[PDB]
C-alpha cells in the first residue's frame, strides 16, 4: 500500500596509475659494463617496454570508453526547478574552482630511479564535465539522448515513463509528486550523511590504491637484495672482486633483478585484466541502467530500479542508484477469475483482490481498488474448467447509458 525511495552507492574501479619502468635504470643504472652485458640477454627489455606500452594503452582505452559514452556535451538550464525535486548535491557547484559538485569533492577528499608515473589522458576536469553532461542529458532528455538526438522532456513525464516501464500506473505520481520529491530529497541527504560518516564506503578504490603502492614499494625494495651475492652494491663488487667471477656474480644479480621485474610485470598484467573486467562491467551498467531503463533484477541496484546518477571518483566511478521499494503490505483474498453468467473473466493487467466482502482489481505493485468491468477483463471459456473460481457480478459500463 506504500512505497519509499532509497539511494544506494555502488563503486566500481575504472583504472589505476599508469607506470613506466626502464630495465637499464632499475637494474643497475649508470654502469656501462651492465649496459654492454644486458645486450646479450636478447630483447627482454623490449618485451617489457612493449608490455608497459600495452597496459598503458589499455588503461587509456578503457578510461576513454567508460566515460565518453556520448559525443555531445549538454548543459543544465539556469533555472533549477524540476517540479519540487532537488539536485543541488549532484549538480556541479559554480563556486568551486574545479567545477565539481560537493559529492565528487567529498569522494576526492576521502581518497588519498627509472620508475615513473604517467599522468592520465583523462584527468579530473573533463571527466567531471562528462559526468555533468551525462547528468544533464538524463535529467532533461531521459533515454532519448542515448538513442539519438536529445529531445526535451519534463522531469515528471520522465518519472511517469519510468514508472510505466517498471509497471506502475501514472495515477500514483501526480497524487504524490510532492511526497515522492520529499522522499527523494530525504534519501539523498541520508545517503550523503552515510557517505560522509562511513570511511569504508570507498573500500574498493582504497584497496586498489594500497595494493598499487605496496607493489611499487616492494619492487623498489627488491633492488637492495643480495640475490646470492656478497653485497647488493655493484661498484664495490666490480672494483673488489676478480672480474672473471665478478661477471658471474653480476650476471646472477641482474638475472635475479630481471626475475623480480618479470614477476612484477606479470602481477601488473593480472591486475590490469581484473581492472579491465571491472571497467567492462561498469560500462555495461552505464549502458543498461544509466542511459535508459533496465528491466534486470538485482543487476545495478536492489529492488525496482528507476535511474542511476554517475559521479566522478579518483581512479574509479561511483553510481547513485535510485530504486523503487514497496512497503506496508496488507492481506487480501484473491481468486483466479470471476464466473459471471456462465463465463470466466480474467484481468488484462491487474489481479482480483478482496477485503472480506467486496472484490476489486488492483495493480501488481500498488493497492488501488477498482470496480470489475469489461474494459480491463477478457472472456475466454466457461467457469467450470478452472479451479478455485468464486462468484461475483460484473458491472457493465455501457448498460446504464441505454437503460434510461
Amino acid at each position: 500500500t506504500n512505497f519509499t525511495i532509497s539511494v544506494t552507492t555502488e563503486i566500481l574501479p575504472v583504472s589505476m596509475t599508469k607506470t613506466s619502468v626502464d630495465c637499464t635504470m632499475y637494474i643497475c643504472g649508470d654502469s656501462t659494463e651492465c649496459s654492454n652485458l644486458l645486450l646479450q640477454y636478447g630483447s627482454f627489455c623490449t618485451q617489457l617496454k612493449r608490455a608497459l606500452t600495452g597496459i598503458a594503452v589499455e588503461q587509456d582505452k578503457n578510461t576513454q570508453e567508460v566515460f565518453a559514452q556520448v559525443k555531445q556535451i549538454y548543459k543544465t538550464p539556469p533555472i533549477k526547478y524540476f517540479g519540487g525535486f532537488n539536485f543541488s548535491q549532484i549538480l556541479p557547484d559554480p563556486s568551486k574552482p574545479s567545477k565539481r559538485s560537493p559529492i565528487e569533492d567529498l569522494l576526492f577528499n576521502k581518497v588519498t630511479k627509472g620508475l615513473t608515473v604517467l599522468p592520465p589522458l583523462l584527468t579530473d576536469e573533463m571527466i567531471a564535465q562528462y559526468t555533468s553532461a551525462l547528468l544533464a542529458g538524463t535529467i532533461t532528455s531521459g533515454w532519448t539522448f542515448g538513442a539519438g538526438p536529445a529531445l526535451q522532456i519534463p522531469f515528471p513525464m520522465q518519472m511517469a515513463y519510468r514508472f510505466n516501464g517498471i509497471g506502475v500506473t501514472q495515477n500514483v505520481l501526480y497524487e504524490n509528486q510532492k511526497l515522492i520529491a520529499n522522499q527523494f530529497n530525504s534519501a539523498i541527504g541520508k545517503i550523503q550523511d552515510s557517505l560522509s560518516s562511513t570511511p569504508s564506503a570507498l573500500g574498493k578504490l582504497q584497496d586498489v590504491v594500497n595494493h598499487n603502492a605496496q607493489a611499487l614499494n616492494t619492487l623498489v625494495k627488491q633492488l637492495s637484495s643480495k640475490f646470492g651475492a656478497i653485497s647488493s652494491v655493484l661498484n664495490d663488487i666490480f672494483s673488489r672482486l676478480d672480474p672473471p667471477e665478478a661477471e658471474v656474480q653480476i650476471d646472477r644479480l641482474i638475472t635475479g633483478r630481471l626475475q623480480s621485474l618479470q614477476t612484477y610485470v606479470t602481477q601488473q598484467l593480472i591486475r590490469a585484466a581484473e581492472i579491465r573486467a571491472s571497467a567492462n562491467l561498469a560500462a555495461t551498467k552505464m549502458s543498461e541502467c544509466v542511459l535508459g531503463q533496465s528491466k534486470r533484477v538485482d543487476f545495478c541496484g536492489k529492488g525496482y530500479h528507476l535511474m542511476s546518477f554517475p559521479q566522478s571518483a579518483p581512479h574509479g566511478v561511483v553510481f547513485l542508484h535510485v530504486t523503487y521499494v514497496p512497503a506496508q503490505e496488507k492481506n487480501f483474498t484473491t481468486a483466479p477469475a470471476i464466473c459471471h453468467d456462465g463465463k470466466a473473466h480474467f484481468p488484462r493487467e491487474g489481479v482480483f483482490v478482496s477485503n472480506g466482502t467486496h472484490w476489486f482489481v488492483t495493480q501488481r505493485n500498488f493497492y488501488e481498488p477498482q470496480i470489475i468491468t469489461t474494459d480491463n477483463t477478457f472472456v475466454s471459456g466457461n467457469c467450470d474448467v478452472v479451479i478455485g473460481i468464486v462468484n461475483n457480478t460484473v458491472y457493465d459500463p455501457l448498460q446504464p447509458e441505454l437503460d434510461s
Partner: protein
Amino acid sequence: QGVNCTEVNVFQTRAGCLIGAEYVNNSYECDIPIGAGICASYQSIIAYTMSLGAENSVAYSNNSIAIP
C-alpha cells in the same frame, strides 16, 4: 616525460615541455594522444586541448516536449 627542460616552439605541460610543436588556442579532434589533457596532431604539427564535442544546450521547460 616527467623531466623539466629548463635544467636538462616550447609549450610546457604537466608531463613535460614540447619542442617542435606550437600550441594552438583553438581545439580540434585529437589524433595522437600524449597525456595530461594535451595531445598533438598533424595538419606542420600543432598541439591543442581536449575537444569533448559540439556544445548543445537543450531548452528544458515544464511544458515543452519534442515528439520525433
